[PDB]
């Protein structure tokens, strides 16, 4: 409970460097992130009840070997079941194998499919319960400023999130969220091992899996 206005926390030099990635990035050479000081890396496994990201193995592998944290995040599509989504995710999780991920399991909602504010919430809602149900494991919500200011409600403040907002050394005013334990700053960077433009991310602590139901 607040007791005085609060703030987004600014970036700083001690969160740890992230990168998150996907098969639009292709063939990654870990060993080259790891050398560019990057210590932890998301990576998109499915989206919508159908999709799954084909790079999802090597890049889980590729980047534990270097030894890198991870972590997996979904694209939600509100046209699709929350529950069949999540269940979907987890599924493909385990098919691949990738049983020992350190970080937060993500849900990337940035798009409401015509959805409603509450509705749209409300999806995402189940959504992570049911992660966090199948999982036993802790879930965080990626999204971005605007659309957390105008397309879902404060329920889902619940929620530690992964915040993006480019440009910026500080995310902007949120309606939902007044801290965050992820911030996506840039979607341009340029990282050792990675073809092309990389997204770029600070982390605090608070994004590591530090707990199980089991
Ligand atoms: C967590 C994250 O940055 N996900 C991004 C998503 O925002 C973007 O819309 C998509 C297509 O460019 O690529 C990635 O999935
Ligand atoms: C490199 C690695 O193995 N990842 C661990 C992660 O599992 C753990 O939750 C976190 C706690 O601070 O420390 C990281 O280094």
Same mark, same amino acid.
């Given at each position: 409970?607040?007791?005085?206005?609060?703030?987004?926390? $600014?970036?700083?030099?001690?969160?740890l =460097?992230?990168i998150?990635?996907? &098969? %639009?990035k292709?063939?990654?050479? *870990?060993?080259?992130?790891? #050398?560019?000081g990057?210590?932890?890396?998301?990576? !998109? @496994?499915?989206?919508?009840?159908?999709? !799954?990201?084909?790079?999802?193995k090597?890049?889980?592998?590729?980047?534990?070997?270097?030894?890198?944290?991870?972590?997996?995040?979904?694209?939600?599509?509100?046209?699709?079941?929350? =529950?069949?989504?999540?269940?979907?995710?987890?599924?493909?999780?385990?098919?691949?194998?990738?049983? &020992?991920?350190?970080? =937060?399991?993500?849900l990337?909602?940035?798009?409401?499919?015509?959805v409603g504010?509450?509705?749209?919430?409300?999806?995402?809602?189940?959504?992570?319960?049911?992660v966090?149900?199948?999982?036993? !494991?802790?879930?965080?919500?990626?999204?971005?400023? $605007? *659309?957390?200011?105008?397309?879902?409600? $404060?329920?889902?403040?619940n929620?530690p999130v %992964?915040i993006?907002?480019?440009?910026? &050394?500080?995310?902007? @005013? #949120? #309606?939902? %969220? $007044?801290? %965050?334990?992820?911030?996506?700053?840039?979607?341009?960077g340029?990282?050792?091992?990675?073809?092309?433009?990389?997204d770029? &991310?600070?982390?605090?602590?608070?994004?590591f899996?530090?707990?199980? #139901? *089991?």
């Amino acid at each position: 409970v607040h007791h005085h206005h609060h703030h987004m926390q $600014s970036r700083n030099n001690n969160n740890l =460097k992230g990168i998150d990635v996907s &098969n %639009w990035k292709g063939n990654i050479n *870990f060993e080259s992130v790891k #050398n560019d000081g990057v210590e932890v890396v998301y990576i !998109k @496994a499915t989206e919508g009840n159908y999709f !799954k990201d084909k790079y999802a193995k090597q890049n889980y592998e590729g980047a534990k070997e270097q030894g890198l944290s991870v972590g997996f995040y979904h694209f939600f599509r509100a046209n699709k079941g929350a =529950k069949d989504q999540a269940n979907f995710f987890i599924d493909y999780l385990n098919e691949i194998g990738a049983v &020992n991920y350190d970080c =937060k399991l993500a849900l990337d909602i940035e798009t409401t499919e015509g959805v409603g504010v509450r509705d749209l919430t409300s999806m995402c809602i189940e959504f992570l319960e049911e992660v966090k149900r199948l999982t036993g !494991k802790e879930v965080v919500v990626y999204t971005y400023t $605007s *659309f957390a200011n105008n397309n879902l409600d $404060s329920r889902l403040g619940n929620y530690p999130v %992964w915040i993006a907002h480019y440009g910026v &050394n500080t995310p902007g @005013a #949120n #309606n939902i %969220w $007044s801290s %965050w334990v992820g911030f996506q700053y840039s979607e341009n960077g340029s990282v050792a091992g990675v073809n092309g433009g990389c997204d770029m &991310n600070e982390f605090t602590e608070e994004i590591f899996i530090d707990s199980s #139901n *089991f």
